[PDB]
Structure 1
Amino acid sequence: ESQFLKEELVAAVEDVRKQGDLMKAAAGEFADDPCSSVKRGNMVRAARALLSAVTRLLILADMADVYKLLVQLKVVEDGILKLRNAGNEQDLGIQYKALKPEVDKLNIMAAKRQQELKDVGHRDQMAAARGILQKNVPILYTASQACLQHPDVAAYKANRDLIYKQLQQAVTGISNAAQATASDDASQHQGGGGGELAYALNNFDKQIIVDPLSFSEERFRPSLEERLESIISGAALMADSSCTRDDRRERIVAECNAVRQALQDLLSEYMGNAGRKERSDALNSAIDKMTKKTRDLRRQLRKAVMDHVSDSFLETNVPLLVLIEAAKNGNEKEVKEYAQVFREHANKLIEVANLACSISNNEEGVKLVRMSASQLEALCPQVINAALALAAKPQSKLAQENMDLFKEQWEKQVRVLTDAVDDITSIDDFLAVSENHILEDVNKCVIALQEKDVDGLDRTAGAIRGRAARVIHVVTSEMDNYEPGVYTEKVLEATKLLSNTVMPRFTEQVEAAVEALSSDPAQPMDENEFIDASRLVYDGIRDIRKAVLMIRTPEEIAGQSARAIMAQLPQEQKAKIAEQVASFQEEKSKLDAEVSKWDDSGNDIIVLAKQMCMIMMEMTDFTRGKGPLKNTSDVISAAKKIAEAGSRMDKLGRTIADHCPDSACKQDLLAYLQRIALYCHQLNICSKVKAEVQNLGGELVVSGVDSAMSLIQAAKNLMNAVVQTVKASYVASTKYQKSQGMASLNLPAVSWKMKAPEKKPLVKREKQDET
């Protein structure tokens, strides 16, 4: 009605008008006498009162918009119910016409709010709820229509009420997201882990460095043994899954026992380091072996997910085409039989997607997958309901139309999910696994030929065609994310040659082999051409992979130096590093802003922070191929230089913590010193992993950049741990006391002097907090 809602708005415009005047005058008097102290304060005083008036206006105006949205919502709500309860195709057509515009208005208003919502989690939630409503309003029409023509088909009634229950859910979803408030901030350190197993594993990597002998960790925290069993129970779901390879099952099992035995050897060593004076070198080595075994298990889980994407995401619409054919031939029992096959495969698809989510630290990507999965789950029974309807009336024109509507809808939604799962998995890993499975399947295909097994030939060729088609699709779509040029050309020629030349010849050879083995007695067949055409599928895929990973020198310790090859890395690999180095620069700029307000003369901690910041950046510039480190011999010495400086900073941090009487402030500082020791150890293990090189065609290639990815990740983590130390080191030094016990020091070693008030580094510290 907006009788009071838009009445307060008029009054709010007056205050903005009044304050605006008072501002103009105070602003004027200041401009004429700008050296005036008082006239200036009056103009600030004015600007503040102007700001309150303006914000109270904009806030009030935004409430007005929310209300307006909720009224449009109740309109579309009653519309959908009126559409559902329509009794004649007349009264139905009337409603749909009156409603369609009301849906569009609502959609626009919804889009607007979506933008004003700060909570990024809800912005995608609103977009989902809008899109669902947008899509099903027409479907509900066609559905509740059919129910009016064939009133005795329970299959239609069920399907209609399903789309309606879906729509009403979306309407509430819109309402729910529309009222999300107010200001949120997602953590960058520590955060954010989308996967429950991904989070658990990363959390455990932080708990191992802390001493569990203490009464603040034994009687007060869940034991490392309990935490690890929560990981193992998660890794168990991955290994015991139906879609998991028996070869991979035994790898996770082996890694779980390996990560378990690595903890017992660490727990027995924490008893040995009870003195905690000089940190045991036997203990530091036990922490290193522990942090390595967590990494190894993580990598096994990654590949375990990759095997699922390779095996379950090929020829996905096959059960549906079979179910639809049984529905077309009006076989009332065959549909019900193929419906349970179709539902089981959809459940397998969902399972593979959820597994992929569990190990992904891509919070955003994981949400899209889970959203896409839940939509597939809701769509599945609706597809089955359309098939059952067609099975009862295979001649009915509407049953043929509805089936086709859900036929293209299911294919579309399976596509949305597979692309979402492709986004949370590495293309490199996918290609390496695809290649391994193609080789295996082509080998099985040729053995089927030699064993005169027509069944095996057709089923192995089906898996090859499906996997080969999926590779072309994942690579083509990935090529869209890159600037067209020399790189994207070769990668697309390779994909076209596979799909347009290699795959068609392979298909023809399979066809001919099956044909020549079907007619009795076994007719002549050129096994040479068959073997050659199969060998080509593997060669085709291997070349696509060769192109995606192609390390080239220009644009228009074998081979070169470790930093030169890093600069020459493929545009695909060069992108992932640039993203991680940018994420590191974010944490690097935080240190520079902190270390600049301090004066060192005087202070060793802030000197060690700068020295570490320097060497830390050389290692990230080596992965960029622009660093002064020429070989892995320079990188290992750089990881040792930060380890020496990280230990010197650990020494100075413990002394300030010892002189600190307040155990609350002391507790924070010592924790960030444990963080430094962990990421110091994690950077030395990242310098040990060599950037391996592979090739078959001749031209050398680097498969995966996870070894370099983890070095930037451990550096960014150390950069955050050092800034939070320098910060806490000062807070503890303000509580500093006259030592009369151990260690004796009346005057502190490090002097916390503030830098002189300077014009230019002050205007740069504001621009750092503004961005």
Structure 2
Amino acid sequence: MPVFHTRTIESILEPVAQQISHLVIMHEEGEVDGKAIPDLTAPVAAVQAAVSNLVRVGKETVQTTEDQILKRDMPPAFIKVENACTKLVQAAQMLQSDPYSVPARDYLIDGSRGILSGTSDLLLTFDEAEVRKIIRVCKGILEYLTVAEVVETMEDLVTYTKNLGPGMTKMAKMIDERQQELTHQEHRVMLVNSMNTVKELLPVLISAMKIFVTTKNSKNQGIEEALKNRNFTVEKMSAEINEIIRVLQLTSWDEDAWASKDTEAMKRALASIDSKLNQAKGWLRDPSASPGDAGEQAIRQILDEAGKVGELCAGKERREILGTCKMLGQMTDQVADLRARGQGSSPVAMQKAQQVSQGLDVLTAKVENAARKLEAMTNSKQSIAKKIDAAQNWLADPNGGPEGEEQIRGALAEARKIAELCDDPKERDDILRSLGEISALTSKLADLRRQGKGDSPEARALAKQVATALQNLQTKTNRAVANSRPAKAAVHLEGKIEQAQRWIDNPTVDDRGVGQAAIRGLVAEGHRLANVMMGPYRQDLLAKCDRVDQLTAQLADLAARGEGESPQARALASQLQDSLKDLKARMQEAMTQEVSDVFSDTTTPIKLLAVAATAPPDAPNREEVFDERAANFENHSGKLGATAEKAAAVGTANKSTVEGIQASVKTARELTPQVVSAARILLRNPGNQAAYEHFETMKNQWIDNVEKMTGLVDEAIDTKSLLDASEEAIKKDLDKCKVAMANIQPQMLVAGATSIARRANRILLVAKREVENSEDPKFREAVKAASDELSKTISPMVMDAKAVAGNISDPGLQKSFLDSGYRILGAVAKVREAFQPQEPVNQPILAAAQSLHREATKWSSKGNDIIAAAKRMALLMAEMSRLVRGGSGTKRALIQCAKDIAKASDEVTRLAKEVAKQCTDKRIRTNLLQVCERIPTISTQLKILSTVKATMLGRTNISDEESEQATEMLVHNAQNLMQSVKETVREAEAASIKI
């Protein structure tokens, strides 16, 4: 298992990769030819010289690191490479004896993998104790997080500040070290963007400590919610401290991410459906007296929240919940058109309305029960990872009496069978070979009893046999996820467009719902878009939602019956994509109007919260006046918490923002009660200094959060979108301000006048973000300068707003006031002038290969700039995908092309950095570097794994599942390669057009 956990490992193995390729390629012609072998006497000690230094340090670490933890696995570890150290020099001198020795041919090549194992084995084994000190430091962080309740006095928090102070400084600097020591930039990003938060919420915690002891003096009603302020934020920081455990424990390329990242929607669902329940039913209990205010949108999101449950749960189950909601929605829409004729009152057609209310009850039952049958595999997957490496513990010591220990590895291996009893029901075929071999290791577990009558020298014998067996048990459960989680979606919509696109040819053979759930994903968001939009467009967009949604089963049948190549199945798939093209441009325009509305009052009710929280005299019902402002605050943010996800739905950008904006969402989600709890306790003792400034922490902690939201969500959308949306919003509100002056409305006028001002400052805010992101002042000077006109004309707004506030029939003021609006409209029109451009036993690597085989058809049909490297990668990626389980005699090109897979990868990285320095935008350059970092990270690994596979090839006494594990490394990481390439081939032009 040649790992790539640390920079120091690749700096040593890639030398050794050159070294063992210098000799295994010669071992070929010992086998395939038996010719006069060239005298490689000189590499023998020289490759030993690349090892003996590590051996002696490996002995020196035994000679120096005195804690027995590394002394239990590492001294057995270099025994193997010292067993390699025995044979390769004997392999030398026997080849000195005989150029043709069959007892040397086997003899040298057994060591060559024992090198590449054992070299790689030792370098991770160095990294073992390297990071376990950091775990205790992380535990020491968590120690203070256990002390984060211990503080009961103001003096204690100062000492606690004096506790965390050296702790946090000791913390982050070691984190910077492993940042340097790592090479997965996508996982490097995981580490730092955890670490900045736990530093950032740290004074917020300390401020919460400040406010707690003040409330410990008087407001011991608040120490309830201040603990709720505290312990949540304590649990918030400790969550990433829990998360950086597996970041530290991330030994190799991750598989467990999406199996754990997609657990979010279930906890999202269960706390959401209960709230959408009552507002749906009593809405639909009086149907024709319910026009669709929010229960229709509740009924909509009930379909939508259950719609992502079917994205999670799959198999035969995914046809069922998709069926019953499509059943329910047409049942409701039948009743919704019983409202248009209106003849159904509350008892008129209740026979239908109960079968709808029970029909939704089927929808809510199957989602909450498949939920526990979704998360149960993840309960076992974390469980099964514990005992597979616990194998090294008891196999190390030959114990005569580990009978209490015998029940531990005995019954937990039976709990692996319980996990196999959890693994069983999803499939049958691959199940029974695992459901048979689960008892096969119990026979080896039965072998623990006989030598458990005190026998050491055979406890080492089956140890090699259970060495293959233990990892084989995990590797089958490693396969248990490609048939228990369906083919997941891109968070990119255009990725899901591609995910939709690839499924159209061969539906059944792929991982499940690669387009089918992607079509289920793409259509379920337009439903989330259409409901908030207005009535006559609502069903109109639902018409555009459901005219393509009727193609769900219509494209789930032409491979389920017959083949799709019949033209009544081809054109029915071909007329699909025409209407499906009509989705995104509406769905973009759908989201476009939303964000310009919901982010209008971005800080505004918060200031209304603030002036509510500023001066209450504790009069009656004025706290209730705050309560609706408090109610406004969620109702503002809950729309904001809704929209930014829908902004993330149609973002059309980097992953990094759209993975980062969702992180910004849940900050704004979870700080939203943290605001109110801070806002309430300021209302409990108004006028207190420490209450005010801690509010001024937390409130301003929310602002720059929602500013970081604001400044990213408009970056999450395009500037063509928002300006037109701003322009149409401001002309409408000015007309709303105009018809407020048609009648006598002064106060609604000046509120709308200030509504311009809060939106005008937003416009100038966007004009800053272009300039700091544009590299050069090509015209971004005018982006300042037109916003400089805004900063001029913002002041005649409010001044005239007061000046027109005297009379609705103020003579000539409204002439100036519409002109004051007309000053804005030409200015925002100048912002449009800115952003214009015019101044063969494995074939899963086949799926990796046939990926970029189909991305050959993009960006043009005429020329090539970088593509030719990617396609000569792809055909060699196609060639190896044969050859990995291919013929048993051409393992030389396994490495000889992996040389190019090193080479042609990082050639593109050279091509990456040059257009990065050619481009005129730092964000596309920052997005280019985060994706092109992994290209050399991956590149040399495929050299390394090809060597291991050459030792797997022609071996004829390998436990072939380990070769299958070696195949799986060539499976996943070439898939991880091929996916990562087209990201750059996207940004080959997705960035380059910005010039």
Shorter-chain TM band: 0.5 to 0.7
1:200 Cα deviation from its structure 2 partner: 6.5
- Is the 2:499–2:514 Cα contact (8 Å) retained in structure 1? no
Q: Which of residues 68, 72, 78 is equivalent to 1:4?
A: 68
> 1:525 corresponds to which residue?
812
Please identify, of 175-184 and 344-353, the stretch whose mean Cα deviation from structure 2 is larger. 175-184
Per-residue deviation, residues 114-158 of structure 1 (Å, max 9, x unmatched): 566677665444334323321222222232233223323122442
* Residues 734-771 of structure 1: per-residue CA shift (max 9 Å, x gap): xxxxxxxxxxxxxxxxxxxxxxxxxxxxxxxxx99999
Partner of 2:766: 474
Residues 681-705 of structure 1 deviation map (CA, whole Å, 9 limit, x = unaligned)? xxxxxxxxxxxxxxxxxxxxxxxxx
Q: Does 1:496 align with 2:784?
A: yes
Aligned amino acid, residue 253 of structure 1: L
Which residue of structure 2 aligns with residue 295 of structure 1? 581
Q: Which amino acid aligns with 1:505?
A: T
For 1:419 and 1:340, the matched residues in 2 are separated by 25
TM-score by length of 2: 0.48
Deviates more, 1:376-385 or 1:5-14: 5-14
From the superposition, tell whether residues 390 and 6 of structure 1 become closer, same or farther in structure 2 (CA, over 3 Å).
same
Check whether the contact 1:445–1:457 (CA below 8 A) recurs between aligned residues. Answer: yes
State the SS of the aligned residue for 2:151: coil
**Matched residue, 1:158:** 225
Aligned residues: 557
The answer on whether the counterparts of 1:6 and 1:64 sit within 8 Å (CA) in structure 2 is: yes
Rate the CA distance shift 1:468–1:145 in 2: closer, same or farther, 3 A. Answer: closer
Tell whether 2:364 aligns with 1:73: no
Amino acid at match of 2:587: L
Query: In the alignment, is residue 546 of structure 1 matched against residue 839 of structure 2?
Result: no
Q: Which amino acid in structure 1 is aligned with residue 151 of structure 2?
A: A
Relative to structure 1, the CA distance from residue 13 to residue 472 in structure 2 (aligned partners, 3 Å threshold; closer, same or farther) is farther
Superposed displacement of residue 175, structure 1: 2.4
Greater shift, 310-319 or 4-13, is seen at 4-13
Mapping of residues 705-724 of structure 1, within 5 Å: none
Given candidates 709, 729, 748, the residue that maps to 1:437 is 729
Q: Distance in 2 between matches of 1:341 and 1:455?
A: 20
The alpha-carbon distance between structure 1 residues 205 and 537, as it changes in their structure 2 partners (threshold 3 A), is same
Whether the 8 Å contact between 1:156 and 1:389 is mirrored in structure 2 is: no
Question: Structure 1 residues 51 and 595 mapped into 2: Cα distance closer, same or farther (>3 Å)?
Answer: closer
Of residues 116-125 and 445-454 in structure 1, the stretch that sits farther from structure 2 once superposed is: 116-125
Indicate yes or no: 2:821 matched with 1:534.
yes
The answer as to whether partners of 1:366 and 1:424 remain within 8 angstroms in 2 is: yes
Write the distance in 2 (CA, Å) between the matches of 1:518 and 1:533.
Answer: 14
Structure 1 range deviating more: 463-472 or 54-63: 463-472
Partner Cα separation in structure 1 for residue 680 and residue 166 of structure 2: 33
Which runs of structure 2 are paired with 1:590-605 in the superposition (5 Å)?
Answer: 590-591=873-874, 593=876
Change in 2 beyond 3 A, CA 1:222/1:163: closer
| Matched residue type, 1:165 | E
How far 1:298 sits from its partner (Å)? 2.2
Structure 2 residue 548 is the aligned partner of structure 1 residue 259: yes
How many angstroms apart in 2 are the aligned matches of 1:372 and 1:104? 25
Q: Kindly state the Cα deviation for residue 14 of structure 1 after the two structures are TM-superposed.
A: 8.3
Q: 1:269 to 1:413 in 2, by over 3 A?
A: closer
The secondary structure found in structure 1 opposite 2:202 is: helix
Change (3 A) 1:37 1:516: farther
Q: Residue 627 of structure 2 corresponds to which residue in structure 1?
A: 336
Q: Please list every run of 5 or more consecutive structure 1 residues that lacks an aligned counterpart in the other structure.
A: 553-575, 598-766
* Paired position in structure 2 for 1:661: none
Contact 1:498 1:540 in 2 (8 A): yes
Contact 2:215–2:222 under 8 Å retained in 1: no
Shift of 1:199: 6.9
Match of 1:391 among 683, 703, 709: 683
CA change 1:425–1:22 in 2 (3 A) is: farther
Post-superposition offset of 1:581: 9.1
Residue of structure 1 equivalent to 2:241: 171
Please list the CA deviations of residues 553-579 of structure 1 after superposition, one character each: whole Å capped at 9, or x if unmatched. xxxxxxxxxxxxxxxxxxxxxxx99xx
Change (3 A) 1:137 1:27: farther
- The match for 1:735 is none
Question: Partner of 2:600: helix, strand, or coil?
Answer: coil
Q: Does 1:96 align with 2:161?
A: yes
Within 2, Cα distance between the matches of 1:192 and 1:473? Answer: 37
Residue 585 of structure 2 aligns to which amino acid in structure 1? R
Aligned-residue offset at 1:548: 1.2
Structure 2 residue corresponding to 1:138, chosen from 191, 197, 203:
203
Shift of 1:536: 3.2
- Distance, in Å, in 1 between the alignment partners of 2:640 and 2:196 is 23
Q: Give the Cα–Cα distance (whole angstroms) in 2 for the partners of residues 443 and 250 of structure 1.
A: 27
Q: What displacement does 1:111 show?
A: 4.2
**Conservation of the 8 A alpha-carbon contact between 2:499 and 2:515:** no
* Cα distance in 2 between the residues matched to 1:136 and 1:5: 34
Shift of 1:41: 12
Compared with structure 1, are the counterparts of its residues 298 and 80 closer, same or farther at alpha carbon in structure 2 (3 Å cutoff)?
Answer: same
Q: 1:240 aligns with which of 513, 520, 531?
A: 531
Contact 2:595/2:643, CA 8 A, preserved across alignment:
yes
1:400 pairs with 2:692: yes
Query: What letter is aligned with 1:80?
Result: L
What code does the residue aligned with 2:144 have?
Answer: G
What does the per-residue CA deviation read over 1:410-451, in whole Å, with 9 as the maximum and x for residues that have no partner? 111112223333343233323333333333334434444455
How much has 1:74 moved relative to structure 2? 1.9
Cα distance, 1:64 vs structure 2: 0.7
2:288 is matched with none
Q: What CA deviation, in whole Å up to 9, does each residue of 1:203-239 have, x standing for no partner?
A: 444455569xxxx79xx99999998677544422221
Closer, same or farther: CA 299–582 of 1 in aligned 2, 3 Å: farther
Decide whether the 8 Å contact of 1:114 with 1:178 is kept in 2: no
Do the aligned partners of residues 246 and 425 (structure 1) sit closer, same or farther apart at CA in structure 2, a change above 3 Å counting? farther
Q: CA deviation at 1:194?
A: 3.5
Contact 1:387 1:403 in 2 (8 A): yes
Moved more, 398-407 or 128-137: 128-137
Letter of the structure 2 residue corresponding to residue 171 of structure 1: I
Q: Secondary structure at the residue paired with 2:775?
A: coil
Q: Is the 8 A contact 1:155 1:386 kept in 2?
A: no
Whether the 8 Å CA contact 1:516–1:524 is kept in 2: the answer is no
Cα distance change, pair 275–348 in 1 and its aligned pair in 2 (3 A):
closer
Tell me the CA shift for residue 59 of structure 1: 0.7
Give the whole-Å Cα distance in 1 for the aligned partners of 2:634 and 2:980: 52
Query: What does the per-residue CA deviation read over 1:377-410, in whole Å, with 9 as the maximum and x for residues that have no partner?
Result: 2212222122222212222110011011112211
Partner of 1:409: 701
Q: Residue 238 of structure 1 aligns to which amino acid in structure 2? A: L
Aligned to 2:600: 314
CA distance in 1: counterparts of 2:239 and 2:637, whole angstroms: 22
> In 2 relative to 1, CA 287–56 (structure 1 residues): closer, same or farther, beyond 3 Å?
closer
Do the aligned residues in 1 keep the contact of 2:675 with 2:698 (CA within 8 Å)?
A: yes
Amino acid at match of 1:256: C
Q: Which residue of 2 aligns with 1:357?
A: 648
Q: Please state if 1:249 is matched with 2:538.
A: yes
Distance 1:403 1:375 in 2: 17
Q: What is the rounded CA distance, in whole Å, between the counterparts of 1:55 and 1:595 in structure 2?
A: 27
Superposition pairs of residues 658-673 of structure 1, within 5 angstroms: none
Amino acid at match of 1:255: K
| Secondary structure, counterpart of 1:519 in structure 2 | coil
Q: For residue 334 of structure 1, what is the amino acid of its counterpart?
A: V
Counterpart-to-counterpart distance in 1, 2:74 and 2:497: 56
Structure 1 length-normalised TM? 0.61
Relative to structure 1, is the Cα distance of residues 16 and 429 closer, same or farther in structure 2, using a 3 angstrom cutoff? farther
